[PDB]
Symmetry: C5
């Protein structure tokens, strides 16, 4: 009933750890798996297509990176649901890591070469805009929509956009903060990151951390270590609580773009994120 | 009476929380809403127009970003106004966040392309000068005017400039610190940020935090999390006091410019800012 | 002579606050005020003029940014200086802030345009080398001279240079550290910042803080908030003491250059700095000769 | 027996220090030592060769930087191995340092000059992508494979790649996180860094720290001091335990590339890493 | 005798301060002092000369920045050198500062101009690779040689290089870590910084702090204040001890290069460093 937080449960199995990895959702789906039928783009987006005019901007779904998310089940707790004091899982902390930055050291491929005069040098490494966000909570991540252009003609099939939610075309307010344009991160690879952002007005049971670095050729930067613990406890020493006993993990990890030798076609590059959450049982009213 | 700070008020409803979001004021007003008659520019400025000579610099009002501000009412406190000791609202801290940086990942529009020779690559993302300032206080933010050029011919109507205050043309001292050029942020979308700055000689009842990053193509950088709390208490453990029971929120969040395929026309881009302020009652003489 | 520091003075008016702002001194003097007679450059330097050869470098005075300084009078404390124990003003901390970076968001002027093909785009914003230094003390800031070129021909009148002090031309040691080349920041808008630097070997009663970022097109960066306090107390909990009851404020805040549409002429841009010093009375054993 | 941690062992020789330096493995082997037969490339990779098509990417082994590792012996502790309580070495901290950044100040060589128009200026210093990772553990560093391209044709001998482990060709999942693609850093100069990354799902007895900075001409940055100590103890005050009395040191330190005056050929540059580990004896079940 | 550190000596003169400034050694010696005979280059290096081929690299001595060092005498302490317990000087902390960055604001000289198309703008300020290292110890700084190219033909006289020490030509191992190539900083302006680096394997009685930033046109960055104290005490609260009663100061502060209007000739720029060390007497066995 009432979310009055009490003491920490002690005894056998009062604490537990949950591990999971979320692969990136840059555009090309996991299947087909064939390295000649499209599977070679897994972990990347398909070629970014440009608007044909100021009033005709329709990006393909496979060129739009979307949020990655997973809902994990935790061991059951309450036998009698009609008891005055119950138990709920509380996320204490998380060790998270973006894996694979070293693969970006491959500068021997067939990307646009650094020396275009002779088509020599090295295969230009991934560079540009970077976006890193991760969240852990007891409910789906609450999202607030905001886009660059309310006129963008996002596909009506295969993606969740503002129009999907409102059942109406976007309005000029959608380029700033429009309270009506909200959703919840309840599906993996469906909510475009250029549309949906963590909602600071909600997410009372989720902790999210994000950072953005723009630019066209900005050098990608990343740190990775198994010695860093992110505390999920709030100012009152209480972490997110799994009311429905289902843990939500959310993230997006864009490293930039690689660009081809043909018409500078850009492809987004994303990397997988690992999570290791420490949880404990909490007595609640 | 005497502004002497005493003990914190204890009991029911002694602490409260206020939320609000302030949309950016980059130049294009919220109306008309039409996505063809001007509304498509909401959240951005109109094309930046340049001076025609060293003595003719007349920027259009809709090309100048202005301060965003809001005045929020707090619940009443003092019944017997003639009491030796009264109660005042004290802002303890604020969780603030700039929302929407992910929207800058839209590089599929019709902006100046990265490969201008062939009109290929990606739509150049927002880059350049960035400005982020937020303030919370019990009175309007005190402003000190200072411009790049005292000869700039700002419109007389539609914006509040130094001449609006003094009733006289700017003088050369306005290019440095002129104590006469002062104002108060009492209106939303009216005070140009290239003219009005936080006044360090006043703002005794306001806390402001600002940073600037210049340049023409500087990569935009931004962090966002719901776990960061900004303490508003001064060296003496006392936060801003709402003397007139009206809380003031102020901000400006410029991310840079997008530039068109015609004559490199630049359009400022701003993002909305969220505020969650925690206040408590204070006993004052 | 002996500066023995004792207890803090308690009682009415034992603590005080001093405020002041120092305007930049980039090259163009405050007057003439006319916006057509030169006043339009106030806050900036005049066009930077270059050397004509490896042996002919004569920069104009109005193209050289100089140190800003002010000497503020504190309330008198001791009527008789022969007393065994006296009181002295001690600087505890300072809230300082560089005001006006927002004005650099003006990219609609007549500077060199970003689209050089069509003379469009935006008016290039101020960029380049930045220099920020501030000091608070009970004596003029002690300066150590050091220049890029000992052969530079600084004007003899209008600026205080190494020659003004030594009465002789600069030597090659002046390009590195030469103990002989020293001065004190006793005048506002007279000591070039490319010549005079805070002297680490002295300044026993002054705390200075400086930083430099070079380059030609480097993005200017600046933070400003009224919530940051700079502690002036040393490792022993003692801040600068005013032996002559005159508080000294010094600074230079260069944001970079703006460059015109004619031969890429550069003009330095400086911004004013605000100071709010908190002082307290300190009991001291008579240090008067 | 049971991996239960007890008290710290006290007495003579209860604490010790281990020193070691690991030379970089950028591509060119330590031999031949001749400065005219290839030895002049020691410390660097050989010229990076680029793919000939989107389906033909065959990097030479000597152009691929690999992990450096060393297994150091610690003095024996357990006389009677069948005892209820035994002693194990525990890594408390490490003083590590990358040596030689000052050699990058050599800008008088024969690299591509800064003034290519006239073949003048200075010899362009090492610039570009940087990668620094170091680890200390009581078992080999656990690796997770992830590549830029699952179609890359790595040599079958001379290097350990995903195929070496699985005995099958890489699949599209190998471009993201594929649980099957795992290995252990058991050989020096054999595991390419663009393939093998620290596995966050394992390494329970190893502490690793890594960072990456991409780009083509990014300035190399490095700090070095003998005053910085890296703590290896976890949240519970326990460091890595040497289960087999063998201490594992792992690292890779890429400073960027130098590029020649012929066809912009790039050569990776790596620097040696010093390790000084402090260990103490720990009572274990 | 036995270097067992005991209590801190108390009483009059048990603590003292030492000041010293070390001028940079960029290449041009202090004399000739004449500003027309070479003295005008004091504080800078002479024109950097490039290799004529992959096998002929002969840098001029005056084009190579070297380490700055000074040995300062401290007052004597022991009369009866054969007493069981003696006193020794211990370095507690140091206030160090690089002086002169403001001189880099001179952009009115005759360097390569910013506008090379018309020969206008400003005189290009010092930029590029930066290197800052300082040390304080009771013995000369221990050095480890490591070079970019073991084939570099350094002058046999006027500089101390690896061959000066080993009496033999450099080997390929010298491009990585070769334990044989070691030396001690016992002379001012003689050991090139592109060859000699602080040896982490030794320096038991010296604390050194260094940092490097590469690139060709990287903006120089520097901070300076008389309020920063660098602690020299190790983890055990003991600082460097002067075994021979002579304190060693070492440093190098390269700000980058300035380049001329002729053939882009580069000249290194160095600045002087001030040291103010606080020492105290220590009882030793």
């Amino acid at each position: 009933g009432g979310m009055e937080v009490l003491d920490l449960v002690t005894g056998p199995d009062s604490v537990t750890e949950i591990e999971a990895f979320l692969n990136p959702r840059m555009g090309q789906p996991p299947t087909p798996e064939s390295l000649t039928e499209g599977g070679q783009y897994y972990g990347w987006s398909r070629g970014i297509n440009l608007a044909t005019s100021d009033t005709e901007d329709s990006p393909g779904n496979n060129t739009l990176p979307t949020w990655s998310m997973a809902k994990l089940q935790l061991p059951m707790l309450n036998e009698d649901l009609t008891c005055d004091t119950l138990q709920m899982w509380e996320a204490v902390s998380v060790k998270t890591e973006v894996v694979g930055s070293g693969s970006l050291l491959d500068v021997h491929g067939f990307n646009k070469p650094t020396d275009t005069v002779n088509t020599k040098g090295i295969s230009t490494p991934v560079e540009g805009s970077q976006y890193h966000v991760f969240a852990v909570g007891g409910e789906p991540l609450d999202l607030q929509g905001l886009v660059t252009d309310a006129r963008t003609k996002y596909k009506e099939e295969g993606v969740v956009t503002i129009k999907t939610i409102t059942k109406k075309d976007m309005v000029n307010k959608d380029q700033v903060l429009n309270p009506i344009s909200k959703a919840k991160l309840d599906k993996d690879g469906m909510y475009p990151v250029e549309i949906w952002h963590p909602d600071p007005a909600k997410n009372e049971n989720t902790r999210y951390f994000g950072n953005y670095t723009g630019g066209t050729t900005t050098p990608p930067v990343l740190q990775f270590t198994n010695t860093l613990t992110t505390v999920l406890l709030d100012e009152n020493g209480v972490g997110p609580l799994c009311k429905g006993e289902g843990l939500y993990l959310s993230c997006v990890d864009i490293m930039g773009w690689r660009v081809t030798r043909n018409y500078d076609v850009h492809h987004w590059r994303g990397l997988p994120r690992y999570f290791k959450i420490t949880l404990r049982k909490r007595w609640v009213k």
